[PDB]
Structure 1
Amino acid sequence: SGRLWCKAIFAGYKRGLRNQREHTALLKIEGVYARDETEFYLGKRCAYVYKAKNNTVTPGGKPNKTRVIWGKVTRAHGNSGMVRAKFRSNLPAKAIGHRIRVMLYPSRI
């Protein structure tokens, strides 16, 4: 009856300064700020979630405007608890600086 996903931003794609690489996001996870406090999240399932004009289906439900691109937090990005994910399609850049729900549910706990 409440939230079951730790919040995270999608900060952008993996990149060198002058060369972007779209297939590999950088998620800033809320409240985690050290390549130390980011083991937990490795292996986890994450979802850019959003909605659109035409309906879609929905697992365990009637048709609905919301869609997601699933992903997976793959590994731990540079020092300040930033992380890397890898989604099943690449994220759309409209997303840059929005929410992507990171789940708990591939747990090693």
Structure 2
Amino acid sequence: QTKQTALVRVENVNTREDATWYVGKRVCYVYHGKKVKRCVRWSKAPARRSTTRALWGRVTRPHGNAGMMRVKFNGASVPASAIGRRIRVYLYPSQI
């Protein structure tokens, strides 16, 4: 395997055209740590302080013919502890 690219299967995305529609969309992997670490708006929104963390990526290209997508995360690769776990594929950036 080459871990710098990840494969994401999205519900109801079962064709290469759908995965093409998703090319460029932001991708988030949400998990939690053991301690409460720094976050965006740590001072502005103290209600966001949590053990919950997120790793962000983007859809680079479709993979195969059945709606699978290739995702690259910002810098570091996504951990293998995320294999089989939930991935958030947002609708932005919007081209429509």
- The TM tier, using the shorter chain, reads 0.7 to 0.9
Q: 1:84 aligns with which of 48, 70, 74?
A: 70
- Are 1:32 and 2:19 matched, yes or no? no
Q: TM-score, normalised by structure 1?
A: 0.78
1:39 is displaced (CA, Å) by 2.0
Q: Distance in 2 between matches of 1:39 and 1:22?
A: 22
Letter in 1 for 2:51: K
Sequence identity, in percent?
49
Question: Which ranges of structure 2 fall in alignment gaps of 5 or more residues?
Answer: none
What is the root-mean-square deviation of aligned Cα atoms in Å? 1.1
After TM superposition, the score normalised by the length of structure 2 is 0.87
- Indicate the structure with greater helix content: 2
Name which of 53, 63, 77 aligns with 1:67.
53
- Which segments of 5 or more consecutive residues in structure 1 lack a partner in the other structure? 1-19
Classify the secondary structure of the residue corresponding to 1:64.
Answer: coil
Where does residue 100 of structure 1 map in the other structure?
Answer: 87
Residue type at the aligned position of 2:63: H
- Greater fraction strand: 1
Q: Higher relative CO (CA 8 A, sep ≥ 6), structure 1 or 2? A: 2
Give the aligned length.
90
